[PDB]
Amino acid sequence: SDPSSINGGIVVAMTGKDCVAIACDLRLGSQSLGVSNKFEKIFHYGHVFLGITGLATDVTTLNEMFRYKTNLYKLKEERAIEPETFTQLVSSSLYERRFGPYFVGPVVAGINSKSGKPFIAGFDLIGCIDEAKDFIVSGTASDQLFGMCESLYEPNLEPEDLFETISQALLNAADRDALSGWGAVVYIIKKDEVVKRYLKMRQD
């Protein structure tokens, strides 16, 4: 019945020195039954990334919705949408369904192409926006992530370092959660390039 606990999954993004990183687990199941070992939850429209945890059907639906919305935007405005802006789009798009929400917990991460400052944010299922300087966590293992992050985190880490951190944060938080895990993916984000690495992790 709790829409937010049927499929399972987690997402977390942090900010480093001229970088951000966002990672997620690959699981998709139906309660106890693990069904898919290949379900990614991080998406990107241009250089803006959005990870979504929650009811898989809604995760998929909102991605589709944001692709559409981002695409049109690009045609009218003639430039790729920015993180600060996308965040507002997500927020409003969520609040639009205030009394029959999408059971999700989105996370936005990216680097403003103009100013270059790293940016990340998270939202509740109805649009409350939480813009933070350190990290954003979401999913069934939110508590665990909040635990790993709060401790493991420290300001201005370089890309190569942030990777380890975000990874250990995700990895260990997942292992204390039944509904998450089954593989993980991390995105290291820099102005110029973005790297995607898959992690070896307990497959239980």
Partner 1 sequence: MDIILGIRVQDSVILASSKAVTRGISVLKDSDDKTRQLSPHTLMSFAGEAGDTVQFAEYIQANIQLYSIREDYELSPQAVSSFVRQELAKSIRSRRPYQVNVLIGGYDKKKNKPELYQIDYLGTKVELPYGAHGYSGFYTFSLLDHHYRPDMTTEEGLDLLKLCVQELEKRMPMDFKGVIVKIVDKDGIRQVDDFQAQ
Partner 2 sequence: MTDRYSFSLTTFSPSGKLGQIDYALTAVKQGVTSLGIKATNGVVIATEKKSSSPLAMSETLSKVSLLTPDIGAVYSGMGPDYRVLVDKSRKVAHTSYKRIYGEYPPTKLLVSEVAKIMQEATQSGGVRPFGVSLLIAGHDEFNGFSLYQVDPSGSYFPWKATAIGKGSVAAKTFLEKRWNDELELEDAIHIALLTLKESVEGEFNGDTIELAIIGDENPDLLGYTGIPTDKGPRFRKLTSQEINDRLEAL
Partner 3 sequence: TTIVGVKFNNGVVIAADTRSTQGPIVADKNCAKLHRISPKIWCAGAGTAADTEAVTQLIGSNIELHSLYTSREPRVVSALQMLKQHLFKYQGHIGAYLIVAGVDPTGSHLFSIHAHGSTDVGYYLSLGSGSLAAMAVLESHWKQDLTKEEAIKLASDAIQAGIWNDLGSGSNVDVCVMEIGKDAEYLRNYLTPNVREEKQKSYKFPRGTTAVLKESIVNICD
Applying CB under 8 A, the residues found at the interface with partner 3 are 44, 46-47, 80, 91, 94-95, 98-99, 124, 126-130, 132, 142-143, 146, 151-152, 154, 157, 160-161, 163-165, 167-168, 171, 187, 193-201
Q: How far apart are CA 51 and CA 180, in angstroms?
A: 15
Binding mask 123-152 for Mg ion (x = CB under 5 A): -------------------x----------
User: Nearest distance from residue 83's CB to partner 2, in Å?
Assistant: 12
Enclosing H/E stretch for 61: helix 56-77
Contact set for partner 1, span 4-33 (CB under 8 A): 7, 28, 30, 33
User: Nearest distance from residue 71's CB to partner 2, in Å?
Assistant: 15
Helix (H, G, I), strand (E, B) or coil at 149: helix
Cβ burial, residue 137 (10 Å; 0-12/13-18/19+): buried
The footprint of partner 1 on this chain (CB under 8 A) covers a number of residues equal to 15
Helix (H, G, I), strand (E, B) or coil at 8: coil
Residues making up the chain, counted from first to last: 204
Which of partner 1, partner 2, Mg ion, none does 177 bind, CB closer than 5 to 8 A by kind? Mg ion
